[PDB]
């Protein structure tokens, strides 16, 4: 039968954190659920207010010869007057009216919309992308006057994207694969036939590629501040809560673009022998399409056409290939652990890194499908939000592939 939630409670309680005025708890999830038995929705960690038992330490964490920004960021002083936004607050630039100039003198230039969203956070729970830990609005005073992209017209590359480029590569694949098999006999008359189809198609419309600077990185005021709130004490579910809501990783490698793919799988059998009269038929049919990237008007127009006997109009692809200019999706990337962005020049930062890695190991182990029960027959285990299960498009049935 199916399996409801299993857990054990906190079994611990922290002392009071002096500067944070709070205390923490975290609990052992045993099994979230299996085979659509009811989910463990209840919290992995929780916290309580305390009037602290001792004074907080000196709260300032000034980087020294760098300007301490009104956001709490740090940067080389002179830029605070230049019309580049260094600070995570434009009005620190407004404050120093006495040396206003932009990083380029005479250039007329665009913001790279590929660069803005570069270095997405990612969560391994589905390889979900998340908005950038990275600032991507600051130029480090660099003029950096690129002119890549199909319109061949200038854009500025913000300080974190060491590389961003707009490569115009494409690829397409076709396979169509068919079989028919027949067996017949007499002594009693017997006959049978089988028929098989397999298809694969894909096509890739690459737009561009990126890498993020692994030193002197400039971060969203929120990410650099959302390190301050951390417990310092390996409170498992709290570091799990940062990993849940800034992601397990941040990435830099790109294939940005549009993509399509298809499969057909069809497999068919019929058998007869012949007073006595005996027969059987077995048949499984499955056809699927994917589209990603580009604008609704053309990308959603294409998505269904792909499945059919319908020969696609070449200018529909050309309209889609144009629209990927506006609306890329990240087709492939290189992951890096999120802790590499908690910077040097902040109090207890190494201990915060130590706890972030241990909490990634906890992330890896508590979602581990090794804990769930074996799928029946030819199947294998699947994980979904709050449940293990399995499913089998192969003449098996039930939420654990139990029957045929």
Ligand X SMILES: *[C@@H]1O[C@H](CO)[C@@H](O)[C@H](O)[C@H]1NC(C)=O
Ligand Y SMILES: *[C@@H]1O[C@H](CO)[C@@H](O)[C@H](O)[C@@H]1O
Q: Contact with ligand X (CB under 6 A): which of 276, 311, 314, 344?
A: 276
In the complex with ligand Y, which residue's Cβ is closer, 27 or 387?
A: 27
> Would you count residue 10 as binding ligand Y (CB under 6 A)?
yes
Least Å from the CB of residue 93 to Ca ion:
5
Residues in 238-277 at the binding interface with other proteins, rule: CB under 8 A: 241, 244-245
The sign of the torsion formed by the CA atoms of 214, 218, 223, 226 equals positive
Q: Which does 300 bind (CB under 5 to 8 A by kind): a second copy, ligand Y, ligand X, none?
A: a second copy
> Would you count residue 84 as binding Ca ion (CB under 5 A)?
yes
Q: Contact with Ca ion (CB under 5 A): which of 71, 82, 144, 192?
A: 82
> Would you count residue 41 as binding ligand X (CB under 6 A)?
no
> Would you count residue 22 as binding other proteins (CB under 8 A)?
yes
Q: Report the alpha-carbon distance of residue 314 to residue 76 in Å, rounded.
A: 52
Least Å from the CB of residue 97 to Ca ion:
12
Q: Which does 364 bind (CB under 5 to 8 A by kind): a second copy, ligand Y, other proteins, none?
A: a second copy
In the complex with a second copy, which residue's Cβ is closer, 350 or 373?
A: 350
Residues in 166-195 at the binding interface with ligand X, rule: CB under 6 A: 184-186, 189, 191
Q: Which does 339 bind (CB under 5 to 8 A by kind): a second copy, ligand X, other proteins, none?
A: a second copy
DSSP code for 338 = G
Residues in 378-397 at the binding interface with a second copy, rule: CB under 8 A: 385-386, 393, 395
Stretch that binds other proteins, among 162-170, 209-217, 346-354, 368-376 (CB under 8 A): 162-170
Torsions phi, psi of 282, nearest 5?
-135, 130
Q: Contact with other proteins (CB under 8 A): which of 7, 307, 364, 369?
A: 307
In the complex with a second copy, which residue's Cβ is closer, 168 or 233?
A: 168
Secondary structure of the chain as H, E, C letters:
CCECCEEECCCCCCCCECCCCEEEEECEEEECCECCCCCCCCCCEEEEECCCCCCCCCCCCCCCCCEECCCCCEECHHHHCCCCCCCCCHHHHHHCCCCCCCCCCCCCCEECHHHHCCCCEEECCCCEEECCCECCCCCCCCCCEECCCCCCCCEECCCCEEEEECCCCEEEEEEEEEEEEEEEEECCEEEEEEEEEEEEEEEEEEEEEEEECCCCCCECHHHHHCCCCCCCCCCHHHHHHHHHHCCCEEECCCEEEEEEEEEEEEEEEEEEECCCCEEEEEEEEEEEEEEECCCHHHHHHHHHHCCCCCCCCHHHHHHHHHHCCCCCEEEECCEEEHHHHCCCCCCCHHHHHHHHHHHHHHHHHHCCHHHCCCCCCCCCCEEECCEEEECCCCCCECCECCEC
> Would you count residue 30 as binding ligand X (CB under 6 A)?
no
> Would you count residue 43 as binding a second copy (CB under 8 A)?
yes
Q: β-strand 22-26 against 74-75: which pairing, if any?
A: unpaired
In the complex with other proteins, which residue's Cβ is closer, 127 or 364?
A: 127
Q: Which does 119 bind (CB under 5 to 8 A by kind): ligand X, Ca ion, a second copy, none?
A: none
Residues in 172-231 at the binding interface with a second copy, rule: CB under 8 A: 172-186, 203, 205, 209, 211, 213-215, 220-222, 226, 229
Site string for ligand Y, 339-368 (x = CB under 6 A): ---------------x--------------
Q: Contact with ligand Y (CB under 6 A): which of 1, 2, 3, 9?
A: 9
Structure tokens at 294: 């580009």
> Would you count residue 305 as binding other proteins (CB under 8 A)?
yes
Q: Contact with a second copy (CB under 8 A): which of 62, 100, 126, 274?
A: 126
Q: Residue numbers of the site for ligand X (CB under 6 A)?
A: 184-186, 189, 191, 275-277
């Amino acid at each position: 039968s199916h399996i409801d939630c299993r857990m054990s409670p906190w079994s611990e309680w922290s002392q009071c954190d002096p500067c944070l005025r709070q205390m923490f708890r975290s609990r052992s999830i045993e099994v979230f659920g299996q085979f659509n038995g009811k989910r463990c929705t209840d919290a992995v960690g929780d916290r309580r207010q305390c009037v602290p038992t001792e004074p907080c330490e000196d709260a300032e964490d000034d980087c020294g010869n760098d300007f301490q920004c009104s956001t709490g960021r740090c940067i080389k002083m002179r830029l605070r007057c230049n019309g580049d936004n260094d600070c995570g607050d434009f009005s620190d630039e407004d404050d120093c009216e006495s040396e206003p100039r932009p990083p380029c003198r005479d250039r007329v230039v665009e913001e790279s919309e590929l660069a803005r969203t570069a270095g997405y956070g990612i969560n391994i729970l589905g390889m979900d992308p998340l908005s950038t830990p990275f600032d991507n609005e600051f130029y480090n005073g660099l003029c950096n006057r690129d002119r890549d992209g199909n319109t061949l017209t200038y854009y500025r590359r913000p300080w974190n994207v060491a590389s961003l480029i707009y490569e115009t590569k494409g690829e397409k694949n076709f396979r169509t694969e068919h079989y028919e098999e027949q067996i017949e006999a007499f002594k009693l008359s017997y006959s049978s036939k089988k028929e098989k189809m397999f298809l694969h198609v894909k096509g890739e419309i690459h737009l561009g590629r990126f890498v993020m600077r692994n030193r002197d990185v400039v971060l969203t005021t929120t990410f650099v501040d959302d390190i301050k709130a951390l417990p310092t004490t390996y409170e498992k579910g709290e570091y799990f809560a940062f990993l849940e809501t800034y992601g397990t990783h941040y990435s830099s490698s790109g294939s940005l673009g549009g993509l399509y793919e298809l499969i057909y799988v069809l497999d068919k059998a019929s058998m007869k022998r012949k007073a006595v009269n005996i027969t059987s038929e077995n048949l499984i049919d499955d056809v699927v399409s994917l589209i990603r990237g580009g604008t609704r008007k053309y990308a959603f127009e294409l998505k269904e056409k792909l499945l059919r006997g319908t020969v696609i109009d070449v200018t529909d692809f050309v309209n889609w290939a144009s629209s990927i200019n506006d609306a890329p999706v990240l087709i492939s990337q290189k992951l890096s652990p999120i802790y590499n962005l908690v910077p040097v020049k902040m109090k207890n930062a190494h201990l915060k890194k130590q706890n972030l890695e241990r909490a990634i190991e906890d992330y890896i182990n508590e979602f581990s499908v090794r804990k769930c029960h074996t799928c029946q027959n030819g199947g294998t285990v699947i994980l979904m939000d709050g449940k293990c299960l399995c499913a089998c498009p192969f003449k098996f049935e039930g939420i654990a592939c139990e029957i045929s």
